[PDB]
Amino acid sequence: SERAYNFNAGPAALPLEVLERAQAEFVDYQHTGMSIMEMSHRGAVYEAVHNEAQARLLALLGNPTGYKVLFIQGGASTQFAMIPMNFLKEGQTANYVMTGSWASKALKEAKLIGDTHVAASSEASNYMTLPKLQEIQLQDNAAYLHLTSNETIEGAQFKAFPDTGSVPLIGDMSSDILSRPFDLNQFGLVYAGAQKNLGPSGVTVVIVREDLVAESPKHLPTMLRYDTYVKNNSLYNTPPSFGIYMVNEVLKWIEERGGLEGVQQANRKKASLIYDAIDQSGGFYRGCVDVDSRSDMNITFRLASEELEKEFVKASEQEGFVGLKGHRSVGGLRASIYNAVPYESCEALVQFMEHFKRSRG
Amino acid sequence: SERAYNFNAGPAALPLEVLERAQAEFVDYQHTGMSIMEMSHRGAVYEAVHNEAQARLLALLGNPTGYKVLFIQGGASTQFAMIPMNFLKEGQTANYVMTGSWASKALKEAKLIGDTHVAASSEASNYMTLPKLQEIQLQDNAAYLHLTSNETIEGAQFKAFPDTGSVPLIGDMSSDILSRPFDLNQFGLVYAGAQKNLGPSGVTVVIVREDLVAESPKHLPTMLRYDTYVKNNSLYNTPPSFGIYMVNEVLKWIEERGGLEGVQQANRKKASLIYDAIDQSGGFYRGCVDVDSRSDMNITFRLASEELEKEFVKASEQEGFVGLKGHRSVGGLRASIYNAVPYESCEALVQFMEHFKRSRG
């Protein structure tokens, strides 16, 4: 107890041990006589954690070469504008894969900057079925192909990504980054707000292939050019010091879990338990996406009626559950089971779901 | 001991009691079963601290009306571009008061957006003498007048601000905000990176007069429009949750210190002690600014030679002092004595300075 069953979608759950280690040295970090947040960002102590965070990330990815890890403020949302601002040139078109609410918000910002094109869309099936890699139509003058790896709101997640050739593949991985191993070489730029699966909100991780950002558009404000972060190791202005420190702590933890392949099989156990609960409910619980498009990060499901779903939420909160209330725009229920969400919280959810069913039947 | 004499210029010193209170509830906040950083930004618990922070700030300012407190990411640097992007229209000119390095960086971004004009400059005296309010020449087509209240690097600070009439006065208060009371009604927009005098880095506080940002330029990306923050209470996308929580803790503390008028007389004691040390040194220590332009936040001084200054830094570090190394571009030494820097750290600095002088004479 005193540790709620947290299924929040973002901000979300952080490992208990990383919170404790952070609490232990919160006031006095490594007997330096000060907190990590009272130290200069150009000092030897912070720069060490700053650079180690970047090194641990790539190592977890299998040590790809030719990529830079940048730490930028503004959330994944600011990246919605920064991406077309840096890569969308005149004569070209920003190609987007439409799979849900976040893909839709990414495209909206792009139009403010230049010409856009919908490469594939799953809107015809209400975003219940992800577009197949074959259905993705790329243009000859495409600046890049942007996709949302995991649709946090609708509960859909790509199992594989397409080969875009010379055209840079860009992916919003806010809700599933570092939850499963993938080939970074397929991407030109990968981004993620840290608050979903890496811990603290206030920092956005951007892994960019060096040759794409060597030279940024001169007309852009200094803070919106990628080369400002590259040439300055994300230290041009004061960085989100504490957040980066916490990101490094979560990375150490992922390694303790057996790296990406370890957290993957663990997250795969948590997901199959909850989906099993849904599939063996004889219709009481209904999945919001086609089985093949199912996400292991965000599980969306519904009940027979709107009132029944209202009863579910209330009952779950009275029993310690937090965040099951499905997103306003979609409705229903959503169990967000990121890396740090324990298998026990899922076990508890499956029992609650079984009891609730029987008390309503 | 185990608490170094921290004179860092930013990130900087935070009150020991605020660090301890924050450490106490770091893992379990108010017996909710989770940390403040694992909770939803739309939930009742975070929204309460989020809004209370805004209420405490205005209250400390004497409760001015018609102003909104916004929490934006990107640091004071992003505001360098966001300001002309939102207020510099065609036909108008962005007027700047040039007083040092930060005023100079603010102006540089502005030119990328539109027409600019130097309203007054202290460059002729090497930024040692602030321009007098009378010397400030405003244009008829001025969009606003921007000034840097405290020049963190050179050590100059305005004692009073000008009456700009219909023209909005905008001020960068990163290094002196909430260190002394002022009439907010004189300004249209005031901004400050929090890491200098309000605590944690990762959040920028913007206090804007409501009538100036009711409607932002439609062409701008969503995250760079002020009305996105106003209409959404800075909750359009995930905010710097933990940082805002820490900002609220520092505000409670400032109140315990007797509000703005209390921290002012305290900061005034710390400054006169150090300046006294400089003025009664018979030339060994030399102030970098004219007495009337002296800052109570950042004290810049020099020694007879470059080698002597190198010896000062080394000796001070071996004795527990952090951050006295003057900024690279200016050289010399800088004692940053923000709100949270104890009178004792200043007492210790004055003794060190006296001993060092005698060991070199």
Ligand SMILES: *Cc1c(COP(=O)(O)O)cnc(C)c1O
């Ligand atoms: C959380 C999320 C975002 C928005 O992140 P913010 O930091 O709130 O801007 C964007 N895209 C996806 C896929 C997300 O999950």
Ligand SMILES: *Cc1c(COP(=O)(O)O)cnc(C)c1O
């Ligand atoms: C610290 C400071 C800045 C820059 O703040 P960042 O958060 O590093 O962008 C700008 N102006 C002044 C006056 C400052 O003191």
